[PDB]
C-alpha cells in the first residue's frame, strides 16, 4: 500500500489517471529518487542486483546540463523481482543517501530528464537545504 500511486508524480502523464494506475501494478520498473549527484550507474547496478537480474537502467539527468540530477529509473526483467526491490531495496543506503524507489509506470523518453525550471528535479528547485551530494544549497 506504500508502493502505490505515488500521487503528484507522473505530471505530463500521457495517458489518463486510470491508465496511470493501470500497468503500474504490473510494471517491472522502479524510479529511484533522492540519490547522490556523484552516484553512478555501476553503483546503482550493484544495489539493484540484490533483488534480481536488472535488464536496463536510466539515470535521471538535468534537462539543461545533462549531468546526473539525483534520480534514476531501474528496469527489472520480472515484476516479482521488482516488487522484491520495492520491499528490500528501498529504505536503505546508496552512496550514504536516501534511495526512494517508487515503481513509476514505465520508461518513456523525456521522463529521464528533470522537470525543474532550473534543469534539475522539481524537488530540487524548492529544497534550499544544504545537501552536498545534491549540489548544496539548491
Amino acid at each position: 500500500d506504500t508502493p502505490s500511486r505515488y500521487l503528484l508524480r507522473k505530471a505530463r502523464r500521457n495517458p489518463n489517471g486510470l491508465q496511470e494506475l493501470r500497468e503500474s501494478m504490473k510494471s517491472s520498473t522502479i524510479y529511484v529518487g533522492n540519490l547522490s549527484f556523484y552516484t553512478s550507474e555501476e553503483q546503482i547496478y550493484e544495489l539493484f542486483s540484490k533483488c534480481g537480474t536488472i535488464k536496463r537502467i536510466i539515470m535521471g539527468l538535468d534537462r539543461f546540463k545533462f549531468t546526473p540530477c539525483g534520480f534514476c529509473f531501474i528496469i527489472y526483467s520480472c515484476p516479482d523481482e521488482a516488487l522484491n526491490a520495492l520491499k528490500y531495496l528501498s529504505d536503505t543506503k546508496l552512496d550514504e543517501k536516501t534511495i526512494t524507489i517508487d515503481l513509476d509506470p514505465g520508461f518513456e523518453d523525456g521522463r529521464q530528464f528533470g522537470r525543474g525550471k532550473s534543469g534539475g528535479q522539481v524537488s530540487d528547485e524548492l529544497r534550499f537545504d544544504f545537501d552536498a551530494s545534491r549540489g548544496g544549497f539548491a
Binding site: Y45, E46, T53, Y88, K93
Partner: protein, 826 residues
C-alpha cells in the same frame, strides 16, 4: 464473515488479559455458532486456517478450541474432524502439483506438521489415548520400509518421525500410556540409529561449518532426539519454553491458563484411526521435503550478563528457534512488520529492547523483556541466531537473500544499546570460524557483511581481522584473508569508489584491497604507456594487462585505423570495411580470411571496449550499435561459432581483467543479445586464462556462472508458461507456438546439458580435494547441487546414466562421486 475472521486473527495482541480475550471470543463465536447452518462452517474453516498458517500461536488457538469444545461438544467433534481431513489434505496433497490439479496452495507437508502439532497441543480437548494411536501409525512408516513399503524414501520416514518428535515439546507429558510411549520410543530410536548412520552422506553437503569446535552442525533427526531424551530425563516437564494456555489459574494459581477449571469438564473426542496415505512413485506425489542440519553458534557464555541460555540439547532451544522461524515466515514481505513479530514472539515479551524503526511503532521486536519462553529467555542472541541460520540454510534460504539484510538493518534501527553489539559479536565469531565454513555460506556472508557495511559508513574494526591480515603468511587462498579480499571488492562496488574503500582500511590491510578497475588496452599508446605503468616486473597488482610494446604487434596498424573509425561516428557497413583490412591482416600471416578471424576478433573487441570504457551504458550502447559485426564475428553455424565466441570472451576478459563488475554485465549482455552462448560462457569459466584470476574460486566468476544458468532456466520457464497459456487458449496456435517454445525449452535444457570437467585432477597424486579446485569446484558442484535441485531431478535419466555413471560410478574417484551421492541422498 469478514468480522469473525478479524476477531479470530487479533486475539493474543491487545492490552487486556489474554484469558479475558479468549473467554469473550469463545462466547461470541458460540453465539455465532447458531448450529452449523448460520456460521459454524465459516468458523471451522477459519479456525483450521489459523492452525495451519499461524503455528507460533498454537497454544492460543488451542485454548479457544478447548473453550469452544467446553460450550459445544458437537463443535469439538466437528473441528477435530475437519482438522484431520485438512491434515489428510495437506499430507496426501503435499505435492505442489496439487497447486496444479486443484490450483490451491494445498501443498507442502510442513503445514501438516503444524496441523498435527495443533492436535497434539489440543490433548485436553481430544482424547490422549487416540493421540498415541496416531503416533504409532506415524512411527510405523519407518517400519513400512521393513515390510509394508520396502522401497520408500528415507525423507518420507523421517518427516513422519519428525512430526511426532517435534510435537513432543507440547504434551509428551501425558502419562496414561507410559508403557506404550516407551515402545514407540524404542522403535523410533532404532529407526533413527539405522537410517541416519546409513544416510549420513546428506549431512556433509548441508553442514554450514565442518568443524566440531565450538559447536557441531548436528543433523535435525539426531538433534531433536537428544532434545527429546533430555526432556524425557526431566520427567517430560518441559519448562521455561512454552507459553501455554491450558493447565492453570482457574484450578491452579500458577500462570498457564485461566481455563483449566472448565477444561477438565468437557468430553475428549477420539481421532478417527488415522492412517498415513501410502507413498506412490516419486513423480506424481511424495515430494518428501529434504532433511536439514541444525545451525548453532550461540550458547552459554556467548553472553554472560543476560539470563543464561537455552541449551543446544534442550526442547527450549528448539521451541524458541521454531517459533522465531515460523514468525518471520508469516510477515517476511513487510520488513517493518517482519520486525514486529520475529523477536517479540509474544506472551507477552514486555519492551526491554523497545524496537525498530526507532519510531517504536513496530515496538514488537522487543525480547528479554521477560519470557514468552516462561523464564527470562535471552532471545536477542537467538533472533540473530535464527536469521543467520536461514540466510546460511543449505541448499537455499527460506526467503530472498537481501531481505535478511534489510530486516537486520531494521533490527539495528531497533534498540542499539543491545542488538548492535550482539550482531557485531556474531560477525566476529563467524569470521573466526571461516576456516571450515561452506563456500556457499562464505559467499553469503561476504555479500551480507559488505551490504551491511554499505548501510553504515564502512565503520568496521579492521584491525580485529589481524589474524589473516597481520599474519599475512597465512597464504591468501586460506578462507579468512580471501573473504576480506572479496568483502573489500564487494564493498568497493558499493562505496562506488576504489579510493573510498582504500582509505577505510588500515595501511596493513591495503595489500588485500580492491585494485583499480580501469581498462587495459592492447592497442593503447604503449610506448608512453611503457613508461606510465609498464613496471612489468613490478605493478603486478593486476591493474592492467597491456601486453603491447609498440607498433609491431599484429594488426596494430588496423587497430589505429579501427580506433579512428570508432570515433567520428562510423557505421556498420563502414565497420565491415575496417574488418576487411584485419581480414587482410590474416591473409598475410597465412589464411586468406581465416573464416572465424580470431585475430580480427581480437582487434575489434579491444578497440571498441576501450572506446566505450567510460560507463556501463557506453559499452551497452557500443555493443548494440555494432551487434551485427559482433554476430558475424562471433560466427554462424556450429562451433566455429563457439571458437571465436570464446575468443570474444577471452579478449573481453583480457581488457576487463581488473574490472569484475564490468565483465559480468558484459557477459550478461552478450548472452541476452545473442552475441555469445551460455554454453560458451560455461567453457570460458573453465578456461586456462580464467583459472588464474584468483581461481575458479573467484566470487564474481561464480556469480557470472550462476546468473548465466538462471537466465537459461528463466528462458526455459518463460517458454513453458507461454506454452500452457496458449494451451489454455484452446490449442489454436499451440500446435505451433508451444512446439517452438518446447524447442526453446529444450534449447536451455539440452544446452544446460553439461559434460565432464572433473575427470582429471584425480589422475595425478595431487590433492584434488580441498585445493582451489575443490574449494570452488566441489563447493560449486554443491552450488550445482543447491538451488538447481529441480534441474537435476528433471535430467535424472541423463544425470544418473549419461552424466554421472559414465565416470561417476565406481570408475571415478570416490571424492567426486561422494558429492553426486550427497545430492541424491537429499
Amino acid at each position: 464473515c469478514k468480522e469473525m475472521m478479524p476477531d479470530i486473527r487479533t486475539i493474543g495482541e491487545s492490552v487486556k488479559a489474554f484469558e479475558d480475550d479468549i473467554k469473550f471470543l469463545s462466547e461470541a463465536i458460540m453465539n455465532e455458532y447458531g448450529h452449523e447452518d448460520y456460521f459454524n462452517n465459516a468458523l471451522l474453516s477459519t479456525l483450521n486456517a489459523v492452525v495451519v498458517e499461524q503455528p507460533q500461536k498454537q497454544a492460543a488457538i488451542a485454548l479457544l478450541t478447548m473453550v469452544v469444545n467446553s460450550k459445544n461438544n458437537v463443535a469439538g467433534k466437528s473441528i477435530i474432524n475437519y482438522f484431520f481431513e485438512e491434515l489428510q489434505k495437506w499430507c496426501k496433497q503435499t505435492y505442489n502439483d496439487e497447486f496444479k490439479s486443484t490450483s490451491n496452495e494445498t501443498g507442502p507437508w510442513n503445514k501438516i506438521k503444524l496441523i498435527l502439532r495443533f492436535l497434539s497441543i489440543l490433548s485436553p480437548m481430544f482424547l490422549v489415548d487416540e493421540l498415541i494411536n496416531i503416533y504409532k501409525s506415524l512411527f510405523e512408516l519407518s517400519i513400512e520400509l521393513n515390510n509394508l513399503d520396502p522401497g520408500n524414501r528415507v525423507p518420507l520416514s523421517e518427516a513422519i518421525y519428525t512430526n511426532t518428535l517435534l510435537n513432543i515439546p507440547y504434551l509428551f507429558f501425558f502419562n496414561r500410556n507410559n508403557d506404550g510411549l516407551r515402545t514407540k520410543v524404542e522403535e523410533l530410536l532404532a529407526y533413527v540409529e539405522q537410517n541416519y548412520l546409513v544416510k549420513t552422506t546428506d549431512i556433509n553437503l548441508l553442514r554450514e561449518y565442518n568443524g566440531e569446535p565450538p559447536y557441531e552442525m548436528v543433523e535435525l533427526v539426531r538433534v531433536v532426539l537428544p532434545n527429546v531424551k533430555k526432556a524425557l530425563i526431566n520427567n517430560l516437564e518441559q519448562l521455561n519454553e512454552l507459553f501455554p494456555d491450558w493447565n492453570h489459574l482457574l484450578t491452579p494459581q500458577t500462570g498457564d491458563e485461566g481455563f483449566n477449571d472448565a477444561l477438565t469438564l468437557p468430553s475428549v473426542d477420539d481421532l478417527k484411526s488415522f492412517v498415513r496415505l501410502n507413498k506412490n512413485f516419486g513423480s506424481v506425489d511424495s515430494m518428501w521435503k529434504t532433511p536439514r542440519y541444525a545451525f548453532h553458534v550461540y550458547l552459554p557464555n556467548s553472553a554472560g550478563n543476560f539470563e543464561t541460555v537455552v541449551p543446544i540439547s534442550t526442547y527450549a532451544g528448539q521451541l524458541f528457534n521454531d517459533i522465531i522461524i515460523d514468525l518471520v515466515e508469516s510477515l517476511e514481505f513487510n520488513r517493518k512488520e517482519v520486525a514486529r513479530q520475529v523477536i517479540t514472539l509474544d506472551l507477552f515479551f514486555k519492551a526491554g529492547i523497545f524496537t525498530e524503526p526507532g519510531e517504536s511503532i513496530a515496538q514488537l521486536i522487543a525480547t528479554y523483556e521477560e519470557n514468552p519462553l516462561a523464564p527470562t529467555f535471552k532471545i536477542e542472541d537467538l533472533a540473530i541466531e535464527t536469521i543467520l541460520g536461514l540466510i546460511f540454510k543449505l541448499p537455499s534460504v527460506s526467503q530472498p537473500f537481501a531481505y535478511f539484510y534489510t530486516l537486520l538493518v531494521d533490527i539495528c534501527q531497533n534498540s542499539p544499546k543491545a542488538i548492535a553489539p550482539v550482531f557485531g559479536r556474531a560477525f566476529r565469531f563467524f569470521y573466526s570460524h571461516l576456516d571450515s565454513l561452506d563456500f556457499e555460506l562464505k559467499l553469503r556472508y561476504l555479500d551480507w557483511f559488505s551490504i551491511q557495511m554499505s548501510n553504515f559508513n564502512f565503520s568496521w574494526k579492521w584491525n580485529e581481522w589481524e589474524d589473516d591480515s597481520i599474519k599475512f603468511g597465512k597464504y591468501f587462498y586460506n578462507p579468512k584473508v580471501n573473504f576480506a579480499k572479496n568483502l573489500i571488492q564487494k564493498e568497493l562496488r558499493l562505496t562506488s569508489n576504489f579510493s573510498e574503500v582504500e582509505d577505510s582500511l588500515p595501511q596493513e590491510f591495503t595489500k588485500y584491497l580492491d585494485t583499480s578497475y580501469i581498462p587495459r588496452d592492447q592497442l593503447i599508446n604503449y610506448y608512453q604507456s611503457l613508461f606510465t605503468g609498464y613496471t612489468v616486473e613490478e605493478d603486478s597488482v593486476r591493474k592492467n594487462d597491456l601486453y603491447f610494446r609498440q607498433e609491431g604487434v599484429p594488426m596494430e596498424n588496423t587497430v589505429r585505423k579501427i580506433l579512428d573509425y570508432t570515433h567520428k561516428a562510423n557505421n556498420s557497413r563502414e565497420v565491415t570495411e575496417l574488418e576487411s583490412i584485419l581480414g587482410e591482416l590474416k591473409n598475410e600471416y597465412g589464411s586468406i580470411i581465416s573464416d572465424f578471424n580470431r585475430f580480427v576478433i581480437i582487434l575489434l573487441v579491444q578497440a571498441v571496449t576501450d572506446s566505450g570504457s567510460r560507463s556501463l551504458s557506453h559499452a551497452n550502447k557500443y555493443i548494440n550499435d555494432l551487434k551485427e559485426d559482433l554476430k558475424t564475428i562471433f560466427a554462424k553455424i556450429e562451433l566455429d561459432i563457439e571458437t571465436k565466441e570464446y575468443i570474444i570472451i577471452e579478449a573481453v576478459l583480457t581488457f576487463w581483467n581488473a574490472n569484475p563488475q564490468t565483465g559480468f554485465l558484459v557477459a550478461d549482455a552478450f548472452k541476452y543479445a545473442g552475441l555469445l552462448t551460455s554454453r560458451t560462457i560455461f567453457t570460458f569459466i573453465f578456461n586456462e586464462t580464467g583459472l588464474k584470476n584468483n581461481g575458479l574460486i573467484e566470487a564474481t566468476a561464480i556469480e557470472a556462472v550462476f546468473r548465466n544458468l538462471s537466465q537459461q532456466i528463466s528462458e526455459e520457464n518463460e517458454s513453458g508458461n507461454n506454452f500452457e497459456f496458449v494451451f489454455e487458449r484452446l490449442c489454436t496456435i499451440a500446435n505451433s507456438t508451444i512446439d517452438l517454445l518446447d524447442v526453446n525449452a529444450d534449447e536451455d535444457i539440452e544446452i544446460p546439458k553439461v559434460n565432464g570437467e572433473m575427470d582429471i585432477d584425480d589422475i595425478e597424486d595431487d590433492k584434488l580435494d580441498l585445493k582451489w579446485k575443490y574449494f570452488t569446484v566441489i563447493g560449486f558442484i554443491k552450488s550445482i547441487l543447491r538451488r538447481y535441485s529441480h534441474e537435476y531431478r528433471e535430467l535424472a535419466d541423463k544425470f544418473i546414466a549419461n552424466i554421472d555413471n559414465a565416470i561417476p560410478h565406481e570408475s571415478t574417484r570416490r571424492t567426486i562421486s561422494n558429492w553426486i551421492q550427497e545430492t541424491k541422498e537429499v
